[PDB]
Design a protein around this ligand. Structure first.
Ligand SMILES: [Mg+2]
Ligand SMILES: [Mg+2]
Ligand SMILES: [Mg+2]
Ligand SMILES: [Mg+2]
Ligand SMILES: [Mg+2]
Ligand SMILES: [Mg+2]
Ligand SMILES: [Mg+2]
Ligand SMILES: [Mg+2]
Ligand SMILES: [Mg+2]
Ligand SMILES: [Mg+2]
Ligand SMILES: [Mg+2]
Ligand SMILES: [Mg+2]
Ligand SMILES: [Mg+2]
Ligand SMILES: [Mg+2]
Ligand SMILES: [Mg+2]
Ligand SMILES: [Mg+2]
Ligand SMILES: [Mg+2]
Lengths: 63, 89, 46, 93, 102
RNA sequence: UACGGUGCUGAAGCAACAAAUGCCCUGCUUCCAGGAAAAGCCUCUAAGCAUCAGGUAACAUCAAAUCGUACCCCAAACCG
RNA sequence: GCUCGCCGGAAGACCAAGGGUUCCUGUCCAACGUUAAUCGGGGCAGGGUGAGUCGACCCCUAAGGCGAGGCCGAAAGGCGUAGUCGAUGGGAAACAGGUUAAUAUUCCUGUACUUGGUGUUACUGCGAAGGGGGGACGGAGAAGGCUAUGUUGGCCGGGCG
RNA sequence: UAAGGUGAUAUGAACCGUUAUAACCGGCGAUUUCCGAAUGGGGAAACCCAGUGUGUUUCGACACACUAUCAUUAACUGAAU
């Protein structure tokens, strides 16, 4: 999922960026904590995905 | 055709305690059946299922370690699924 | 009867706390020894 | 706005727990574990945006971790913040 | 790399099944393997209604050491040691004694 | 009432006398041993601003974060 | 539960200091309890601390501490100016009632208030790390006025032993 | 380098991978809360509070960056004189 977006545009990425949090991450916590989320591994990725997201963008702009 | 106004709830238990699973439907007159990960056992000495229709309540006692799965209830067209884990002492 | 330990945290920290310890060449050597000794509580503070 | 959309990851979990929670549902307001650094106003925003409800005012308190178990050594839990949120009127969730 | 690995068919060399063949179920990072129908231990397991388990004695396979098995040649029909050669940039295992790539 | 409690309802609700070490009193009287500080507050203007900005009032509205708040506390919870 | 007995300027009640979950509810009785223990401040699990107004933070300083430069000292360091810290003292403001098993001047009902920002409308010289005022202060004593508070009558409800 | 992996007590859950972006090892990067020389001021270490800059198709208040001291050098300023 790495070089798939090494080339994905600084501005564009801040989108999935939110889309990881804006959607997956917040909904997942809530849904999870509330005893729904039967597939926990979704919490592992998403978080790890955002890490990737922020690794680029940081390495694309300025660094 | 009804739904599940109130889904189940994942609960923990120390083998021996008593788990609890509630779920309200929409129309009375019916009889669903609870099942661990997905195994339709049979209310026995270790299973206490008490439902009066318009409502359904489960009461599992000293739950073993296997019960390590999810409580998916089945009725007419409704379907719930909570989380349950049996921890040892 | 009134015994010797009359607890009071204000005095505790002021007399033995991290910063107090830090405010003197020897107070610092106090820490240094405790670090070298690998002590888990350098100075019993909050 | 005032608080970035990113930082509206302050809502951490519902505290649907005890009649305290639910009996204080049946008479306005909802309660939640919420961040730690969260600023009442900062957490009102979260509940406006997400949850899309109305909110009159929010009260906060810090729960302190119980320390327990162990033989010689000892184990302590984490501190955390409580919500108690009080929704305006067209009350839903 | 590892000589005995996951989906293999092997013949036991030592102790109580000595000479029993079987397929490796899995291989544990202790340096052990679980091989089917080779080592059987009768565990006593409590019956559970929730999991719909009958209970009573059950039969399963314990982990034997990797050095207690060797993979079955089946061209000679005996145990055989494994080497590693390179073929077309692939590190392949090969049987010793007839030198055949597995 | 599941015998721990929990709901509901609900009369009169005045006067006289007494009365503190509390308050009036940071008062009053008197005495010698002659009884913190600084800010908030009020007022005064300097540089400075003069239609401005500020200042005063009425009404309206918005803000007041953060941290503590359980329990013991002349004691079986503190020093012994 | 009914008797009996004990404290009542406490052996009742609210805190500070100090402790730091001992609070409440279920559950257990091995160890802890100088005995038993179904009980506990004991084990395990869950719950419980809601504030513009109480308090801290905050503004203000006492003792005293620290102290750019500085003076002094074989080194380490010492003292001290400008300052800057330090409450045991000064500084704006919420009360009667209700409710939780467990908090409440914090939650709820009734009824209030404090200080700033912004706006409208009137009316106006505003303005300091500065001047002055105030804040601002001892001991004893003497009564007067008064409240808490009490007693009686009236009033209300109930009683006819 | 690889057929197995998601550190340990420590099972379990939900997963991930098998011919190369599973894991694991090495080189170089990235992120790197708060306290601590701690260096913006303070302080009972892990906390309180700022000045100035930036930042908002919901441009308030909050968030971030910078602001210690000494030395050397330069520049600009500049008493009694
Ligand atoms: Mg609070
Ligand atoms: Mg209390
Ligand atoms: Mg305890
Ligand atoms: Mg208790
Ligand atoms: Mg005993
Ligand atoms: Mg206890
Ligand atoms: Mg001061
Ligand atoms: Mg010096
Ligand atoms: Mg000095
Ligand atoms: Mg004080
Ligand atoms: Mg209480
Ligand atoms: Mg105005
Ligand atoms: Mg003056
Ligand atoms: Mg009176
Ligand atoms: Mg008679
Ligand atoms: Mg600092
Ligand atoms: Mg400093």
């Amino acid at each position: 999922m790495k070089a798939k977006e090494l080339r994905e545009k600084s501005v564009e990425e801040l989108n999935t960026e939110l889309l990881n949090l804006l959607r997956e991450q917040f909904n997942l916590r809530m849904q999870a904590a509330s005893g729904q989320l039967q597939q926990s591994h979704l919490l592992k990725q998403v978080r790890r995905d955002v890490a990737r997201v922020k690794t680029l963008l940081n390495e694309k702009a300025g660094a | 055709l009804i739904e599940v106004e109130k889904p189940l709830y994942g609960v923990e238990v120390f083998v021996g305690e008593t788990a609890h699973f509630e779920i309200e439907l929409s129309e009375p007159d019916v009889h669903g059946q609870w099942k661990l990960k997905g195994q339709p056992l049979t209310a026995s000495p270790d299973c206490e299922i008490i439902e009066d229709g318009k409502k359904h309540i489960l009461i599992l006692h000293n739950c073993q370690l296997g019960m390590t799965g999810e409580v998916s209830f089945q009725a007419a067209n409704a379907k719930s699924a909570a989380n349950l884990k049996v921890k040892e002492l | 009867m009134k015994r010797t330990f009359q607890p009071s945290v204000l005095k505790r920290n002021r007399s033995h706390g991290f910063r107090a310890r830090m405010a003197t060449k020897n107070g610092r050597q106090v820490l240094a020894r405790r670090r070298a000794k690998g002590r888990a509580r350098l100075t019993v503070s909050k | 706005m005032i608080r970035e959309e990113r930082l509206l990851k302050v809502l951490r979990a519902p505290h649907v727990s005890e009649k305290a929670s639910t009996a204080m549902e049946k008479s306005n307001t909802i309660v939640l574990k919420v961040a730690k650094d969260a600023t009442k106003a900062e957490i009102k925003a979260a509940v406006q945006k997400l949850f899309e409800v109305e909110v009159e005012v929010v009260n906060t308190l810090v729960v302190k971790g119980k320390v327990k178990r162990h033989g010689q050594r000892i184990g302590r839990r984490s501190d955390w913040k409580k919500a108690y949120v009080t929704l305006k009127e067209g009350q839903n969730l | 790399a590892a000589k005995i690995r996951r989906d293999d068919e092997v013949i036991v060399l030592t102790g109580k099944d000595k000479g029993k063949r079987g397929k490796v179920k899995n291989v544990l990072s202790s340096g052990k393997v679980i091989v089917e129908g080779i080592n059987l231990v009768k565990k006593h397991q409590k019956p559970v209604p929730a999991l719909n388990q009958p209970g009573g004695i059950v039969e399963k396979e314990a982990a034997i050491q990797v050095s207690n098995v060797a993979i079955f040649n089946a061209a000679t029909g005996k145990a055989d040691r494994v080497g590693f050669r390179f073929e077309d940039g692939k590190k392949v295992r090969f049987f010793k004694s007839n030198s055949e790539t597995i």
